[PDB]
Amino acid sequence: EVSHVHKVECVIPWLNDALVYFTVSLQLCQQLKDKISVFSSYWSYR
Amino acid sequence: MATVMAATAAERAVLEEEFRWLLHDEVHAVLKQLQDILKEASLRFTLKQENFILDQVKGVLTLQGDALSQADVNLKMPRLLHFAFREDKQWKLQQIQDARNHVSQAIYLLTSRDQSYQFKTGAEVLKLMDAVMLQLTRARNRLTTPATLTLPEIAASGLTRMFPALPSDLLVNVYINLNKLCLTVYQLHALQPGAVLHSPGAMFEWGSQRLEVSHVHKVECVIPWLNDALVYFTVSLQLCQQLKDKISVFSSYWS
Amino acid sequence: MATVMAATAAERAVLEEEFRWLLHDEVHAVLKQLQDILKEASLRFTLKQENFILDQVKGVLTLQGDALSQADVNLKMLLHFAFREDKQWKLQQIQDARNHVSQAIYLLTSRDQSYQFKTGAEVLKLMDAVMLQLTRARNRLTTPATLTLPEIAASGLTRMFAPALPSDLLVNVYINLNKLCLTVYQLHALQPGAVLHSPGAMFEWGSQRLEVSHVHKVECVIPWLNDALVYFTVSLQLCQQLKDKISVFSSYWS
Amino acid sequence: MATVMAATAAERAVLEEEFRWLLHDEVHAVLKQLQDILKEASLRFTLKQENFILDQVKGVLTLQGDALSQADVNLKMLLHFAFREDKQWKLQQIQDARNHVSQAIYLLTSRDQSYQFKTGAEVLKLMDAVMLQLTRARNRLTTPATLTLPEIAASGLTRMFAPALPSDLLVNVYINLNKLCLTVYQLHALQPGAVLHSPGAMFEWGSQRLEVSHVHKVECVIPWLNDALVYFTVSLQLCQQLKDKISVFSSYWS
Amino acid sequence: MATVMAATAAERAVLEEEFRWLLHDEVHAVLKQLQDILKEASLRFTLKQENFILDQVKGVLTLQGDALSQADVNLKMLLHFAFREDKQWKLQQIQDARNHVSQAIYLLTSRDQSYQFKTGAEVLKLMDAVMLQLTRARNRLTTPATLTLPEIAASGLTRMFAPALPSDLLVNVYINLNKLCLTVYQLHALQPGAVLHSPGAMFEWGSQRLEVSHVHKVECVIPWLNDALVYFTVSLQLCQQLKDKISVFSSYWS
Amino acid sequence: MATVMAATAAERAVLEEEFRWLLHDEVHAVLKQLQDILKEASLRFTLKQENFILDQVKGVLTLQGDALSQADVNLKMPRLLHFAFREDKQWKLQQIQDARNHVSQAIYLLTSRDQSYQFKTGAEVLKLMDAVMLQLTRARNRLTTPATLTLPEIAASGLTRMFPALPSDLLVNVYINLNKLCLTVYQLHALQPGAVLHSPGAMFEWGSQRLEVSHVHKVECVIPWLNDALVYFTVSLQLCQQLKDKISVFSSYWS
Amino acid sequence: AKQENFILGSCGTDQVKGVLTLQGDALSQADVNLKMPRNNQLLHFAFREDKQWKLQQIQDARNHVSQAIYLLTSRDQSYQFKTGAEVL
């Protein structure tokens, strides 16, 4: 049986950087998708 | 008594949930059917007949997909003249390209969704339906005769350049009208010392000269695969509308 | 099965209904209590002590309702002052407070006590209105900060004393929450804003520039003002309690 | 040029992202601190002094948690009173306060500390909930104004004294923010409302009409109540600070 | 009849127009007054007394603006302390308050006084902004509750005394609304949170665990802080009055 | 001066009130007219002609209300075959039932209101109008040719079972198109080792076999009472729209 | 420079403290002090030989990153797209 639980933690700066990069990239992708959909809904991409 | 009310509330909650699953299955069924129909509609725009014969002015046009690959025209005057393209050249009909784009977008809207999520209110389905229907109605609308094409725009069109090379008493326009490939010849008349009418007696300026439409000759021919495509659009629109209506009935029923 | 479910909507709906009747009775109980308390608060303002004695300045003021009917003041600088004729200086704070009380009571008595309880937002609006009136009355009773020394000078009170008084003295009488306050400002013009009310404050008056050299403040508790304030506090709490219960109810069944 | 602009959306988006991680860490830091402080505040209410001595009336009260286990009172009118058996009178204010604390702590411990910060409106809602619980606890600890003399009479406390006591006396024990309060109301029925709690207040009880002739009030500071209140104040300020920082952030990047 | 009705829209519209010009003049009057008062409040923070004397601990502090330039302290435990060099400890509360004042004044002076009165919601927004700045200044001046003993220890002030001082003493200097406050915490580490600031409070510092054994608090009124606070209160009331009049107007003609 | 402004304000208040009564009377007038027209439209769906003769394929159909009581069909092949129902059986046309339901609902919307209340803003009238118009437009839409009927749905329809009993090289469909009773015969062709087109060359699966439509024969005949009903729908829709527009003009006029 | 040693926990607030050396996805060291079971005792543990503890989360994430980059780089960046749907 678990009697006690001890949890310690630390920010990992480069992991944090990675997450930030993932999020920002996701945002770039969605913005591009939105522009493409907006344009394409009326005009042809080519 | 609280036990009655709780067991009870569980009974209504169960019925509503089961109905939510029914509606889930209905939604995805209709969506799948939409992808099938719309992909067939898509297949109609790319390669079926290619040569078409179009009154008192006659024409043989070879149309491959969206490209009017050739256009051979005979005009019977009070006198007959005969025209053709540069042999090497193709005139693209923008309406078909546009329509094909809208179809492509609709199909993307249908295939870029996870067909595996649990059912919700429906407002999201409603938005999907609106998007798809907008694309379909736009495709159909583009296929229809554009009213806002001026005679100077027709003159400035590449099609005039595309013919033996011919005078400035004649303008030639080829367009699509729903389910019909259309050839129109405008016979003109320079005037002695707007542009929207397209009827005999319409006036406009071109180049640096002022011109009047003297006569208009209109011939047309049904394009079978365009007709199939339009039929597909209509059916898809109705399927979408039916799904929207059922979702509304459901949502109002349990609220 | 649909019969189970119909029985079920019925029993839930019955419980909720009965609870709305409970809340109905509670609302009107509280409202009636509010009218009682507020009418007593009202009775404090109309007509109980009238003479009041207010350590280097002392004064005897006769206050009748909102009217300061007499003010006999002794100042050690001993010089002595009184009112002329039988004239009364009205303390506007009391008038204003009485007005807010009157309005609250109107809000309570001009309503249909055959309410057949609806939702509660209407009750909530009523509660807000009444509470606004009460809090405003109490706020007015409190010492007004935004009174300038030139406004004090331009007040009729300065004109009001017998013998006719000097331009090195200003007299102000006001109410601070629940105690009659008498303040004497001793000035003297300087050789060749107005908000601080403290020694060393400067301001203009008439066509001359003056500085407050010191300030004398005496005060005395007014029992019926205290009663009124207690009534305001209790009424506010009753209102708040009703609002909170209504919110709990409405969130409970929604 | 589009490449410049893409680089540009990238750098702005990176800065904003990093700042959201900062705000993420700040939020959880504050939340953890709130749980610590509030759990200590909670520990003050459960089980530290138990015997308390409360100038013309004096009393010795033994208070265990929310239960007034004994109350031995001497009154100069000298007469002497005590509890019967080993019975305890519960002070509901403490119970209520403890409930609000319990709720706040639940609000803090029943949340996912793997938040991956979103916007802040959710944090803001949490902050509002907790602050409401704290402010309510503190408000309850404060002297309730809306307690009528007949409610005091109908309270079990009157029944609770040994020897069995007279109908010219009422006894009330309550908590005012942080100090145990004992009040004795001396009455006497008149010959052929209820809210003021002051000498000269009139009310009905049983089938007889009574008037408060005078009131005796003694009080004593309760150290752990004071600790709890200090905790409430500090927690409220921490919450407010977090709300304000979130608002600054959200307005800054919007 | 339409002529009657046209005349009629004309007369109503004229009355409402004239009243908007009245409200226009009132708004700008109040605004100008606010700039005057707030600029004086501002003048209190920049440069008037500088030396202050703050019953078992006593101290002489020289405070210049926001900078505590010197602090000579005597403690009975008699031991004596002072600053090193000619260094100044800045009291951040004063800096913050001065910032809020600066912002309020900007809000007032960066606006077009050729307003041609519109509706009032814009005025209301301005009033809200200014009032927020004032209330924040005042709140900051008040004693911060959320300061932990380890934060006090980590403060530069502990490092700041000559002779270099012991680890059984902590010194904190802060401002509480309007009076310079000096507090000495007497500690002693125990044998093998931090928020209460009272005797018997426990916390960690460095790598050791410490408990506050007792606390000594002395304070002294700062006259110009008091003036500033009075200014804040008056400004807040002026703002509130303007808001209320605007609301009455807008509800009156709607 | 306040007396001027008050008497004055009373003058405008009086004019606006009187106009509100005018609009009240107009609203109820239009509503009554709607009940009359719609009840006549309703009466058209229940009992007028019952026998109908419907190109190169011919038919005599007996239609009673919503029930196709009999359908006698001659098909002229390259060779003629003759078909009839079980004599005893009736095929119900769902479009008519649906339309009749919408009409019933519209009439309920009109008759279940107190024709005696004082006039208000109109938003309530606007909602009533929207409801009624939705019912009418739905009735009309249902009467129209349903596009979303697949060939396998036609095969799975009871109508096929209803005929002497006939092969699986023939499918028979009877439906309504606005103002025309329609009979369509699909001539099929099993294929050697979607379904939406309804045109020659369309493919689909049925039973456990794969089939292709080889030819399509379409005949139709006007149904007089359906035409009357449709005319009624159109007129009612216009009456509703006119009332909506007038109410909007009023409400914008006095705001 | 990129950080390799990380401090988890404090001496006073926690009963566990650790200095973990994390290299890429690999936990190369975990040097841990535990103040258990009593508040004056302390036990000590640390990695054994030159071992790598793989944090699977980091490896997986890195794989997905690689795949995304592949999707972007497995294209002729002089490739004109045909429809908008292809880009989507």
Side-chain angles (χ1 to χ4, degrees):
Chain A
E1 153 180 324
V2 173
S3 64
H4 316 277
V5 178
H6 308 177
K7 191 197 165 79
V8 291
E9 59 187 358
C10 170
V11 168
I12 310 294
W14 59 268
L15 272 188
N16 195 85
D17 289 345
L19 290 177
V20 166
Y21 286 143
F22 295 168
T23 290
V24 171
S25 296
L26 280 172
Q27 289 183 16
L28 285 177
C29 291
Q30 254 308 328
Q31 292 176 356
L32 184 52
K33 284 192 61 176
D34 292 338
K35 293 185 186 159
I36 286 171
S37 289
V38 164
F39 180 91
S40 301
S41 74
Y42 193 80
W43 294 305
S44 309
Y45 183 82
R46 249 181 175 89
Chain B
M1 173 60 171
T3 297
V4 181
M5 307 190 315
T8 60
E11 294 292 340
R12 192 86 207 171
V14 164
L15 275 66
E16 182 179 352
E17 218 32 60
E18 301 180 326
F19 263 96
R20 294 183 84 84
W21 284 107
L22 289 178
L23 186 51
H24 176 259
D25 285 286
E26 172 83 21
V27 162
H28 287 291
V30 170
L31 286 181
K32 172 185 181 316
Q33 192 178 351
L34 280 171
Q35 311 193 18
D36 295 342
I37 298 181
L38 285 186
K39 285 181 173 170
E40 282 296 327
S42 179
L43 279 179
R44 300 307 165 94
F45 284 80
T46 68
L47 47 85
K48 151 174 46 182
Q49 187 171 345
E50 314 182 352
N51 298 321
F52 301 95
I53 56 106
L54 288 68
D55 297 29
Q56 302 333 308
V57 176
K58 293 179 179 179
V60 177
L61 283 69
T62 304
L63 172 65
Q64 286 167 12
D66 53 14
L68 186 59
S69 65
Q70 180 64 59
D72 280 4
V73 191
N74 298 349
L75 175 58
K76 161 99 187 59
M77 315 199 200
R79 283 228 192 170
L80 175 148
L81 308 192
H82 176 67
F83 329 115
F85 277 19
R86 202 39 66 157
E87 265 191 23
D88 289 345
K89 293 179 179 179
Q90 61 188 354
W91 177 246
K92 270 185 190 189
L93 300 181
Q94 87 179 356
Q95 296 172 264
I96 299 182
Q97 203 193 356
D98 294 343
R100 181 181 55 248
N101 170 67
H102 293 305
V103 176
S104 172
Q105 282 303 310
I107 294 179
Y108 175 80
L109 286 169
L110 292 174
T111 64
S112 69
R113 188 153 178 284
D114 53 348
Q115 306 152 6
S116 72
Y117 176 77
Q118 318 185 42
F119 177 80
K120 19 50 195 182
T121 73
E124 192 180 354
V125 204
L126 291 177
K127 284 179 186 175
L128 175 59
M129 291 291 95
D130 288 337
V132 173
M133 293 178 77
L134 181 63
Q135 287 311 301
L136 297 175
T137 53
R138 274 179 179 171
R140 173 177 72 192
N141 282 349
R142 308 272 179 144
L143 278 190
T144 296
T145 301
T148 67
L149 172 72
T150 64
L151 296 160
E153 275 164 345
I154 294 175
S157 169
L159 191 64
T160 308
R161 316 179 200 148
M162 283 274 301
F163 291 101
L166 291 194
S168 38
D169 173 344
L170 285 184
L171 277 178
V172 172
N173 186 27
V174 175
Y175 59 88
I176 302 178
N177 191 343
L178 297 173
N179 82 333
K180 293 172 184 58
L181 177 56
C182 298
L183 165 64
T184 297
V185 176
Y186 297 100
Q187 222 171 3
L188 308 171
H189 181 60
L191 299 177
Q192 304 180 31
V196 161
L197 293 174
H198 287 268
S199 64
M203 330 180 209
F204 70 104
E205 179 283 332
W206 175 232
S208 317
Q209 323 82 7
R210 302 183 171 278
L211 292 62
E212 152 182 327
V213 174
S214 65
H215 315 278
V216 179
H217 309 279
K218 285 165 339 193
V219 290
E220 60 187 359
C221 170
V222 168
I223 309 293
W225 60 269
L226 270 186
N227 193 85
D228 289 345
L230 291 177
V231 165
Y232 282 145
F233 294 169
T234 291
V235 171
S236 297
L237 280 173
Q238 288 186 17
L239 287 178
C240 291
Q241 187 64 247
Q242 291 175 355
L243 185 52
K244 285 190 61 176
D245 290 336
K246 294 184 187 159
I247 285 172
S248 171
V249 164
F250 179 97
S251 165
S252 293
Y253 190 83
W254 297 97
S255 308
Chain C
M1 172 60 171
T3 297
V4 182
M5 307 189 312
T8 59
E11 296 289 346
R12 191 225 161 175
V14 165
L15 177 63
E16 183 179 352
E17 215 33 60
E18 301 180 326
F19 263 95
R20 289 193 288 265
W21 284 107
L22 289 178
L23 186 52
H24 173 83
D25 285 284
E26 172 82 21
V27 162
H28 288 291
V30 171
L31 286 180
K32 174 185 186 33
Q33 191 177 351
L34 280 171
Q35 310 193 17
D36 296 342
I37 298 181
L38 285 187
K39 285 181 173 170
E40 282 296 326
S42 179
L43 279 179
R44 294 305 170 282
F45 285 83
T46 68
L47 187 60
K48 160 178 314 176
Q49 187 170 345
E50 314 182 352
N51 298 321
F52 300 95
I53 64 105
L54 289 68
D55 195 75
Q56 305 335 116
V57 176
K58 280 277 175 330
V60 178
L61 284 69
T62 304
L63 172 64
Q64 287 165 340
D66 52 14
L68 187 59
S69 65
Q70 99 185 331
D72 283 0
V73 193
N74 299 348
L75 173 55
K76 142 94 187 307
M77 206 178 126
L78 172 149
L79 163 54
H80 173 65
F81 326 110
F83 278 3
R84 255 162 27 208
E85 294 260 60
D86 286 328
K87 173 56 178 49
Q88 61 188 3
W89 178 246
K90 271 185 189 188
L91 301 181
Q92 205 189 8
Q93 296 172 264
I94 298 182
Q95 205 197 355
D96 294 343
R98 184 183 57 249
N99 171 66
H100 293 305
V101 176
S102 173
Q103 281 302 310
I105 294 178
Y106 174 79
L107 286 169
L108 293 174
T109 63
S110 69
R111 202 161 200 272
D112 193 359
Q113 303 159 6
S114 79
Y115 214 85
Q116 64 180 20
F117 205 80
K118 304 219 209 210
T119 65
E122 250 272 302
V123 209
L124 290 177
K125 288 178 186 298
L126 176 59
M127 291 292 95
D128 288 337
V130 173
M131 292 178 77
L132 181 63
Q133 289 312 301
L134 298 175
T135 53
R136 274 179 179 171
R138 171 165 71 192
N139 283 349
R140 179 60 178 163
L141 278 190
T142 296
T143 281
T146 67
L147 171 72
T148 64
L149 296 160
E151 275 164 346
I152 294 175
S155 169
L157 190 63
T158 308
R159 315 177 207 158
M160 280 275 303
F161 288 101
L165 292 194
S167 327
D168 58 317
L169 285 183
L170 276 178
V171 172
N172 186 234
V173 175
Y174 59 88
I175 310 280
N176 183 359
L177 177 63
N178 71 319
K179 251 177 292 153
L180 193 40
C181 298
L182 165 64
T183 297
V184 176
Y185 297 100
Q186 89 148 13
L187 310 170
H188 60 285
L190 295 174
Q191 334 161 354
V195 160
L196 292 175
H197 288 268
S198 64
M202 331 180 209
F203 71 104
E204 162 283 326
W205 176 233
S207 319
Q208 43 291 316
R209 302 182 171 277
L210 292 61
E211 152 182 327
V212 175
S213 61
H214 26 273
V215 180
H216 312 279
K217 287 165 342 201
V218 290
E219 60 187 359
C220 170
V221 167
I222 310 294
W224 60 268
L225 270 186
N226 194 85
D227 289 345
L229 290 177
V230 165
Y231 283 144
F232 294 169
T233 291
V234 172
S235 297
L236 279 173
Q237 289 186 17
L238 287 179
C239 291
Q240 187 64 248
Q241 291 174 355
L242 185 52
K243 285 190 62 176
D244 290 336
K245 294 184 187 159
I246 284 172
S247 171
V248 163
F249 180 97
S250 165
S251 293
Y252 189 84
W253 297 97
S254 310
Chain D
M1 172 60 171
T3 297
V4 182
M5 307 189 312
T8 59
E11 296 289 346
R12 191 225 161 175
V14 165
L15 177 63
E16 183 179 352
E17 215 33 60
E18 301 180 326
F19 263 95
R20 289 193 288 265
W21 284 107
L22 289 178
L23 186 52
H24 173 83
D25 285 284
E26 172 82 21
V27 162
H28 288 291
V30 171
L31 286 180
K32 174 185 186 33
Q33 191 177 351
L34 280 171
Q35 310 193 17
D36 296 342
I37 298 181
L38 285 187
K39 285 181 173 170
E40 282 296 326
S42 179
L43 279 179
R44 294 305 170 282
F45 285 83
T46 68
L47 187 60
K48 160 178 314 176
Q49 187 170 345
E50 314 182 352
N51 298 321
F52 300 95
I53 64 105
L54 289 68
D55 195 75
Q56 305 335 116
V57 176
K58 280 277 175 330
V60 178
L61 284 69
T62 304
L63 172 64
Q64 287 165 340
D66 52 14
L68 187 59
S69 65
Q70 99 185 331
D72 283 0
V73 193
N74 299 348
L75 173 55
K76 142 94 187 307
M77 206 178 126
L78 172 149
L79 163 54
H80 173 65
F81 326 110
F83 278 3
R84 255 162 27 208
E85 294 260 60
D86 286 328
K87 173 56 178 49
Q88 61 188 3
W89 178 246
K90 271 185 189 188
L91 301 181
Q92 205 189 8
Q93 296 172 264
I94 298 182
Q95 205 197 355
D96 294 343
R98 184 183 57 249
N99 171 66
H100 293 305
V101 176
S102 173
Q103 281 302 310
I105 294 178
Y106 174 79
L107 286 169
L108 293 174
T109 63
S110 69
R111 202 161 200 272
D112 193 359
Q113 303 159 6
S114 79
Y115 214 85
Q116 64 180 20
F117 205 80
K118 304 219 209 210
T119 65
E122 250 272 302
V123 209
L124 290 177
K125 288 178 186 298
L126 176 59
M127 291 292 95
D128 288 337
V130 173
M131 292 178 77
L132 181 63
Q133 289 312 301
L134 298 175
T135 53
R136 274 179 179 171
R138 171 165 71 192
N139 283 349
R140 179 60 178 163
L141 278 190
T142 296
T143 281
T146 67
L147 171 72
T148 64
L149 296 160
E151 275 164 346
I152 294 175
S155 169
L157 190 63
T158 308
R159 315 177 207 158
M160 280 275 303
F161 288 101
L165 292 194
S167 326
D168 58 317
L169 285 183
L170 276 178
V171 172
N172 186 234
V173 175
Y174 59 88
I175 310 280
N176 183 359
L177 177 63
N178 71 319
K179 251 177 292 153
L180 193 40
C181 298
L182 165 64
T183 297
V184 176
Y185 297 100
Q186 89 148 13
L187 310 170
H188 60 285
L190 295 174
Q191 334 161 354
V195 160
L196 292 175
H197 288 268
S198 64
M202 331 180 209
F203 71 104
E204 162 284 326
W205 176 233
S207 319
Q208 43 291 316
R209 302 182 171 277
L210 292 61
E211 152 182 327
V212 175
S213 61
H214 26 273
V215 180
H216 312 279
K217 287 165 342 201
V218 290
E219 60 187 359
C220 170
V221 167
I222 310 294
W224 60 268
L225 270 186
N226 194 85
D227 289 345
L229 290 177
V230 165
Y231 283 144
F232 294 169
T233 291
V234 172
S235 297
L236 279 173
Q237 289 186 17
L238 287 179
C239 291
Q240 187 63 248
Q241 291 174 355
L242 185 52
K243 285 190 62 176
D244 290 336
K245 294 184 187 159
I246 284 172
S247 171
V248 163
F249 180 97
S250 165
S251 293
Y252 189 84
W253 297 97
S254 310
Chain E
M1 172 60 171
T3 297
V4 182
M5 307 189 312
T8 59
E11 296 289 346
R12 191 225 161 175
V14 165
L15 177 63
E16 183 179 352
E17 215 33 60
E18 301 180 326
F19 263 95
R20 289 193 288 265
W21 284 107
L22 289 178
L23 186 52
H24 173 83
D25 285 284
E26 172 82 21
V27 162
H28 288 291
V30 171
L31 286 180
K32 174 185 186 33
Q33 191 177 351
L34 280 171
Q35 310 193 17
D36 296 342
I37 298 181
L38 285 187
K39 285 181 173 170
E40 282 296 326
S42 179
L43 279 179
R44 294 305 170 282
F45 285 83
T46 68
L47 187 60
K48 160 178 314 176
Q49 187 170 345
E50 314 182 352
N51 298 321
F52 300 95
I53 64 105
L54 289 68
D55 195 75
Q56 305 335 116
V57 176
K58 280 277 175 330
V60 178
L61 284 69
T62 304
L63 172 64
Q64 287 165 340
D66 52 14
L68 187 59
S69 65
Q70 99 185 331
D72 283 0
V73 193
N74 299 348
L75 173 55
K76 142 94 187 307
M77 206 178 126
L78 172 149
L79 163 54
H80 173 65
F81 326 110
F83 278 3
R84 255 162 27 208
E85 294 260 60
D86 286 328
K87 173 56 178 49
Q88 61 188 3
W89 178 246
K90 271 185 189 188
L91 301 181
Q92 205 189 8
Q93 296 172 264
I94 298 182
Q95 205 197 355
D96 294 343
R98 184 183 57 249
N99 171 66
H100 293 305
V101 176
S102 173
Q103 281 302 310
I105 294 178
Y106 174 79
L107 286 169
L108 293 174
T109 63
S110 69
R111 202 161 200 272
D112 193 359
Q113 303 159 6
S114 79
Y115 214 85
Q116 64 180 20
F117 205 80
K118 304 219 209 210
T119 65
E122 250 272 302
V123 209
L124 290 177
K125 288 178 186 298
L126 176 59
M127 291 292 95
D128 288 337
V130 173
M131 292 178 77
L132 181 63
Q133 289 312 301
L134 298 175
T135 53
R136 274 179 179 171
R138 171 165 71 192
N139 283 349
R140 179 60 178 163
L141 278 190
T142 296
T143 281
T146 67
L147 171 72
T148 64
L149 296 160
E151 275 164 346
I152 294 175
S155 169
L157 190 63
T158 308
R159 315 177 207 158
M160 280 275 303
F161 288 101
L165 292 194
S167 326
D168 58 317
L169 285 183
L170 276 178
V171 172
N172 186 234
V173 175
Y174 59 88
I175 310 280
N176 183 359
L177 177 63
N178 71 319
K179 251 177 292 153
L180 193 40
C181 298
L182 165 64
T183 297
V184 176
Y185 297 100
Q186 89 148 13
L187 310 170
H188 60 285
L190 295 174
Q191 334 161 354
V195 160
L196 292 175
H197 288 268
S198 64
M202 331 180 209
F203 71 104
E204 162 284 326
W205 176 233
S207 319
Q208 43 291 316
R209 302 182 171 277
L210 292 61
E211 152 182 327
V212 175
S213 61
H214 26 273
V215 180
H216 312 279
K217 287 165 342 201
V218 290
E219 60 187 359
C220 170
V221 167
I222 310 294
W224 60 268
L225 270 186
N226 194 85
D227 289 345
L229 290 177
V230 165
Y231 283 144
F232 294 169
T233 291
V234 172
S235 297
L236 279 173
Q237 289 186 17
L238 287 179
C239 291
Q240 187 64 248
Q241 291 174 355
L242 185 52
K243 285 190 62 176
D244 290 336
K245 294 184 187 159
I246 284 172
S247 171
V248 163
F249 180 97
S250 165
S251 293
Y252 189 84
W253 297 97
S254 310
Chain F
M1 173 60 171
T3 297
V4 181
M5 308 190 315
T8 60
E11 294 292 340
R12 192 86 207 171
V14 164
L15 275 66
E16 182 179 352
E17 218 32 60
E18 301 180 326
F19 263 96
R20 294 183 84 84
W21 284 107
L22 289 178
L23 186 51
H24 176 259
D25 285 286
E26 172 83 21
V27 162
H28 287 291
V30 170
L31 286 181
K32 172 185 181 316
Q33 192 178 351
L34 280 171
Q35 311 193 18
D36 295 342
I37 298 181
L38 285 186
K39 285 181 173 170
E40 282 296 327
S42 179
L43 279 179
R44 300 307 165 94
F45 284 80
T46 68
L47 47 85
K48 151 174 46 182
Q49 187 171 345
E50 314 182 352
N51 298 321
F52 300 95
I53 56 106
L54 288 68
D55 297 29
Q56 302 333 308
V57 176
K58 293 179 179 179
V60 177
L61 283 69
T62 304
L63 172 65
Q64 286 167 12
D66 53 14
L68 186 59
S69 65
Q70 180 64 59
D72 280 4
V73 191
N74 298 349
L75 175 58
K76 161 99 187 59
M77 315 199 200
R79 283 228 192 170
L80 175 148
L81 308 192
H82 176 67
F83 329 115
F85 277 20
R86 202 39 66 157
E87 265 191 23
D88 289 345
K89 293 179 179 179
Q90 61 188 354
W91 177 246
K92 270 185 190 189
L93 300 181
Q94 87 179 356
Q95 296 172 264
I96 299 182
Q97 203 193 356
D98 294 343
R100 181 181 55 248
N101 170 67
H102 293 305
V103 176
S104 172
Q105 282 303 310
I107 294 179
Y108 175 80
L109 286 169
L110 292 174
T111 64
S112 69
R113 188 153 178 284
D114 53 348
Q115 306 152 6
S116 72
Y117 176 77
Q118 318 185 42
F119 177 80
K120 19 50 195 182
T121 73
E124 192 180 354
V125 204
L126 291 177
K127 284 179 186 175
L128 175 59
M129 291 291 95
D130 288 337
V132 173
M133 293 178 77
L134 181 63
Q135 287 311 301
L136 297 175
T137 53
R138 274 179 179 171
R140 173 177 72 192
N141 282 349
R142 308 272 179 144
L143 278 190
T144 296
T145 301
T148 67
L149 172 72
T150 64
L151 296 160
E153 275 164 345
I154 294 175
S157 169
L159 191 64
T160 308
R161 316 179 200 148
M162 283 274 301
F163 291 101
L166 291 194
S168 38
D169 173 344
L170 285 184
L171 277 178
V172 172
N173 186 27
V174 175
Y175 59 88
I176 302 178
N177 191 343
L178 297 173
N179 82 333
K180 293 172 184 58
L181 177 56
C182 298
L183 165 64
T184 297
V185 176
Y186 297 100
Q187 222 171 3
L188 308 171
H189 181 60
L191 299 177
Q192 304 180 31
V196 161
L197 293 174
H198 287 268
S199 64
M203 330 180 209
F204 70 104
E205 179 283 332
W206 175 232
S208 317
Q209 323 82 7
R210 302 183 171 278
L211 292 62
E212 152 182 327
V213 174
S214 65
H215 315 278
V216 179
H217 309 279
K218 285 165 339 193
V219 290
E220 60 187 359
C221 170
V222 168
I223 309 293
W225 60 269
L226 270 186
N227 193 85
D228 289 345
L230 291 177
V231 165
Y232 282 145
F233 294 169
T234 291
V235 171
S236 297
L237 280 173
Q238 288 186 17
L239 287 178
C240 291
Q241 187 64 247
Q242 291 175 355
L243 185 52
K244 285 190 61 176
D245 290 337
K246 294 184 187 159
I247 285 172
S248 171
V249 164
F250 179 97
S251 165
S252 293
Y253 190 83
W254 297 97
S255 308
Chain G
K2 162 177 169 185
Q3 187 171 345
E4 317 179 350
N5 297 321
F6 300 96
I7 306 162
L8 288 67
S10 301
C11 283
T13 173
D14 297 276
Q15 304 168 10
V16 173
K17 188 169 185 168
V19 178
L20 281 67
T21 305
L22 172 64
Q23 287 165 340
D25 53 14
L27 186 59
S28 65
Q29 179 69 277
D31 189 6
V32 194
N33 297 347
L34 311 175
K35 279 188 283 194
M36 311 181 201
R38 287 194 188 278
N39 289 337
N40 62 305
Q41 300 178 340
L42 181 150
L43 301 83
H44 175 66
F45 311 99
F47 271 24
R48 286 192 123 248
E49 279 180 26
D50 184 1
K51 159 58 176 44
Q52 297 296 323
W53 179 245
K54 228 73 172 215
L55 298 180
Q56 200 62 56
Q57 296 171 264
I58 304 181
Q59 202 195 356
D60 293 343
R62 183 185 204 302
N63 290 333
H64 291 303
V65 178
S66 172
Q67 184 54 42
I69 298 179
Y70 174 82
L71 287 169
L72 294 174
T73 61
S74 308
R75 193 162 314 267
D76 170 356
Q77 304 157 11
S78 311
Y79 171 71
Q80 312 183 354
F81 284 89
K82 39 142 199 171
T83 66
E86 193 185 357
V87 206
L88 290 177

